[PDB]
Write a protein that binds this ligand. Structure first.
Ligand code: MG
Ligand code: ZN
Lengths: 96, 159, 174, 92, 165
RNA sequence: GAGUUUGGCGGCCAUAGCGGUAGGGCAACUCCUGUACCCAUCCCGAACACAGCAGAUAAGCCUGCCCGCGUUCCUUACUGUACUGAAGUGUGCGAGCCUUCGGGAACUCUGGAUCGCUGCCAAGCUCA
RNA sequence: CCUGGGGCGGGACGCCCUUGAAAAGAUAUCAAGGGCGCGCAAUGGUUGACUCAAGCGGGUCGGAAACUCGCUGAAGAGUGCAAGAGCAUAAGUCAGCCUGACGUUAUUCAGCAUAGCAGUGGAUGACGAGACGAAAGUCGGCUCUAGCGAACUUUUGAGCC
RNA sequence: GGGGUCCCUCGCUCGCUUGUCAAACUCCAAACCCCCCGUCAUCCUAGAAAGUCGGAGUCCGGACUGCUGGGGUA
């Protein structure tokens, strides 16, 4: 039977491209975010700590608070609001 | 087991042989026939299929045998070059009880070919064009698809 | 040798062997200015750096070429010159409005009584705040330049000129 | 596996790190004056006794290695959620 | 600044086992080298030697500077200044073999120890090859700056007088 | 007030890599020189560390060049092809496929470009 | 109990990974590939120093089988074990020092999308103690995802009612 | 490495040019689709989104058009 683990069916959700494999840009890991700012969840597979679910990969979260290094995001999953803790390595700002 | 069983293409490609078990290999022996060195054949024709069909390896071997024998008896042993382009990569599995645990065992391979995809390419001289064309006609009678011949090289050389 | 399209070239600083990015990620998590001390074979240089996504920016700096104007004549690439450069950097950064920062020796190896730790002791003695352990500090006679008697008698001008430069720079910035 | 007989860890009572001696916990004999023994004596009569006629169940493939970490300073031992192992020995 | 100067001298003793023999090997290597000598560990176990993984097999020493120059002069003396082109590497780093440590004067043969042959190799580089070894901004040396085999034999003839044929 | 060079820290992480040729250093950098000391070798002052007068731009480095390999981009053709969103009293014995409106490749090909761009600070010089 | 009727066979009866699955999420079958019910005081933590697999070249019966030197080498190795993902001045290897394989405690995830649901984990934190380190940091075991179990009962640990 | 002075036969192995593939392959890569922002549109104080409570039924479904859906000779 199939499993129910957190990494289930994440062969390409949590995979890095060939020319971004290895160390990531360190400037992405100290990008400070403001209160209420909209940020995109684009999970960095190399950074194995503070990662959200693969189910939130590609969702825009509204920053509502900080819990140390990571940020608190109000993410939408279908019809429910979720609080998704993610470090700045996995987040990316939305530009207008 | 007639070819009508494993003919229609309604299933995905079952070719990754490291995740299956014990495929009986194809009976197809060769894929190049005739002069495998003379690249200077002016008139070149190809047998193309005009449906989406799965050709069994036994069908491919029978077609190759009839076409090669006709070409050897028509244009001599070294007066032609005939190429079977497609390898049988798909593995054909039969549910050898009832429908419980229906994923069958591999009972042979086959080649999945698209419409207008060339099966046999034949290169011949000017005078041996008709014999090569007629042998390719006999080759497609052993295949499960409607087949039409198309001329690759020397369209002006014939008419 | 980028043999094909599946070749991952290192980053440009890593290709040039000039920056470690794992150490850079470790240091940038502090959210504090870095005391980027770099030593050259003929003199020493110290910077205060704060990163922004456009690139690093440097607030204050100080090299061994500035020690001439304060009355220094000896070698600019020894422990004494490193200490004087660190003290000048600390006083100048205090004057500009910076008093904190974590040490950053980068790719340079860590060993007690080096020129980098001499510059660190110079920065600490100027009032600039930087977390450090006194084990890696050099002895006071080494900062004075008490090596002189081994090889050369023309090195004997070092300690008096070091003390003179120290008092001059302290009067200059305070 | 192996765990040292003595190693320095955290004593939650003295609230400091100290050398602790590890001792295997001994499953004690069941007391005959507990409330369940009195209830079992009170439920014995003619016929089935319910939970006291049950034969106790089997065992897991590997039991946990039940260990106690007695502090060497204040002597107060504590015990923590222990690993599960087949063969256990003490390194000295 | 193109002279292929002697970067280092390498000496190795392929004992092939350990016990008393390897200790005697490292002791005599230290005696004839004038420098502390380290051993070597087998990478995998092979029943033909009957060796085991992570088991000491041989001993090696790295010689530099005037010690390297004097030891290489002694090795050239034992070889009688004779060497052929096949010894040289593709980049001029030579390596040859000797079969008797008693060829070295100053050391007395012992009946227990026997005769030992040690493989010596000296690497020849150019003044500026430190860039590929340092820790600050290490870069690869190009093809032009490297040392050719003919330049190596020319250097060995001019500095050591070893004719290579 | 501005510019060139040099150094440190970088951002984007190959348009930046791999490879080949031609030029330069006053200041700088490097190579390079020793081992009293600080520090160090699973041995070697090789690296690190320290103290540096020389000598050398031969390499690091900088400038220009070469389409050769890789990458990226445009370009003509393949081609509005493949594939596909919607609808269809359109069609095939069947596996299926067609028309309309709306999107739209990849490979290859033609002719070309790309042998990095840029941010901060400091040292110098040359400002009008 | 499931079950292309039931039975025989099997466990698709608990947990984990790839495809199926139609490029958000979800998605069944006795669907396909399978694995787990463990091992480890180091096969763990941290700092420093290095880089691996495999080729070509040189070295003496040390053979085309050992060990050693140079060159190519973004990984073709290793990381305990399924599968997938991660990693190169390293998440690998070696060595120094250590025991964070620490006591207590709060949230949100995901088992269980949407959308209730057990004991459990797994990511952020907090209080108190440390280890290594110049410091930044890292350490709540072994790179991430399996290795396990309610109520009742008994035993044990510290102090109390 | 295989065969009738290891004289020479010679299959694998490595490059240039061809011929085919993948559901557990990807240097590439759509159209749908999903999160967020702006705009228009529609709903909305005659009550948006949210919340609390009362009442259930329901967990035998089936079909048409697509996904070459999976399995199957069908
Ligand atoms: Mg039943
Ligand atoms: Zn205690």
């Amino acid at each position: 039977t199939n499993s129910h683990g957190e990494k289930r069916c994440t062969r390409y959700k949590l995979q890095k491209t060939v020319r971004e494999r290895g160390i990531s840009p360190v400037s992405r890991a100290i990008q400070e975010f403001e209160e209420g700012q909209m940020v995109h969840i684009d999970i960095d597979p190399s950074v194995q700590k503070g990662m959200p679910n693969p189910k939130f990969q590609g969702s825009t979260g509204k920053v509502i608070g900080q819990r140390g290094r990571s940020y608190v995001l109000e993410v939408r999953s279908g019809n429910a609001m979720k609080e998704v803790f993610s470090l700045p390595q996995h987040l990316k700002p939305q530009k207008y | 087991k007639p070819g009508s069983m494993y003919r229609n293409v309604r299933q995905r490609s079952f070719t990754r042989r490291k995740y299956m078990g014990g495929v009986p290999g194809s009976q197809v022996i060769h894929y190049d026939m005739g002069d495998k060195a003379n690249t200077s054949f002016p008139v070149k024709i190809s047998l193309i299929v005009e449906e989406k069909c799965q050709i069994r390896h036994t069908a491919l071997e029978a077609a190759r045998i009839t076409a090669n024998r006709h070409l050897v008896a028509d244009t001599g042993k070294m007066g032609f070059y005939m190429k079977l382009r497609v390898y049988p990569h798909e593995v054909i599995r039969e549910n050898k009880s009832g429908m419980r645990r229906a994923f069958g065992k591999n009972v042979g391979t086959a080649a999945r070919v698209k419409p207008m995809q060339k099966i046999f390419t034949v290169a011949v001289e000017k005078q041996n064009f008709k014999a090569a064309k007629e042998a390719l006609w006999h080759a497609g009678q052993k295949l499960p698809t409607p087949c039409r011949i198309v001329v690759d090289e020397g369209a002006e050389l014939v008419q | 040798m980028a043999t094909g399209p599946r070749y991952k070239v290192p980053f440009r600083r890593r290709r040039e062997g000039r920056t470690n990015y794992h150490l850079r990620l470790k240091l940038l998590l502090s959210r504090q200015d870095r005391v980027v001390v770099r030593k050259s074979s003929r003199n020493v240089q110290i910077q205060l750096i704060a990163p922004t996504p456009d690139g690093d920016i440097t607030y204050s700096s100080a090299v061994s070429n500035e020690l001439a104007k304060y009355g220094y004549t000896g070698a600019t690439g020894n422990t004494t010159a490193a200490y004087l450069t660190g003290l000048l950097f600390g006083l100048k950064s205090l004057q500009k409005g910076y008093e904190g920062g974590i040490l950053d020796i980068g790719l340079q190896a860590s060993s007690a009584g080096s020129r980098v730790y001499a510059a660190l002791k110079g920065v600490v003695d100027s009032g600039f705040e930087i977390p450090c352990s006194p084990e890696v500090f050099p002895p006071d006679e080494r900062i004075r330049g008490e090596h002189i008697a081994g090889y050369r008698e023309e090195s004997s001008d070092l300690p008096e000129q070091f003390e003179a430069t120290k008092e001059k720079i302290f009067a200059e910035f305070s | 596996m192996k765990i040292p007989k003595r190693f320095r860890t955290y004593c939650p009572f003295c609230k400091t790190h100290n050398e602790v001696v590890v001792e295997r916990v001994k499953k004690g004999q069941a007391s005959s004056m507990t409330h369940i023994a009195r209830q079992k004596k009170r439920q014995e009569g003619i016929g089935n006794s319910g939970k006291f006629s049950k034969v106790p169940g089997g065992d897991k493939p590997t039991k946990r290695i039940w260990l106690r970490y007695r502090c060497t300073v204040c002597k107060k031992a504590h015990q923590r959620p222990c690993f599960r192992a087949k063969k256990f020995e003490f390194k000295e | 600044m193109r002279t292929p100067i002697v970067e280092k001298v390498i000496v190795h003793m392929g004992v092939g086992e350990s016990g008393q023999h390897l200790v005697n090997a490292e002791d005599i290597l230290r005696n004839i080298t004038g420098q502390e000598v380290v051993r070597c560990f087998a990478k995998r176990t092979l029943p033909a030697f009957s060796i085991k993984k992570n088991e000491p097999i041989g001993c090696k020493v790295t010689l530099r500077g005037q010690k390297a120059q004097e030891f290489l002069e002694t090795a050239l003396g034992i070889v009688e200044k004779t060497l052929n082109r096949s010894q040289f590497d593709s980049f001029g780093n030579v390596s040859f073999g000797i079969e008797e440590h008693t060829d070295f004067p100053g050391m007395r043969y012992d009946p227990n120890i026997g005769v030992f042959g040690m493989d010596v190799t000296v690497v020849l580089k150019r003044p500026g090859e430190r860039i590929c070894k340092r820790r600050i901004a290490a870069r690869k040396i190009p093809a032009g700056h490297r040392v050719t085999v003919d330049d190596a034999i020319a250097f060995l003839n001019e500095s050591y007088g070893v004719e290579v044929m």
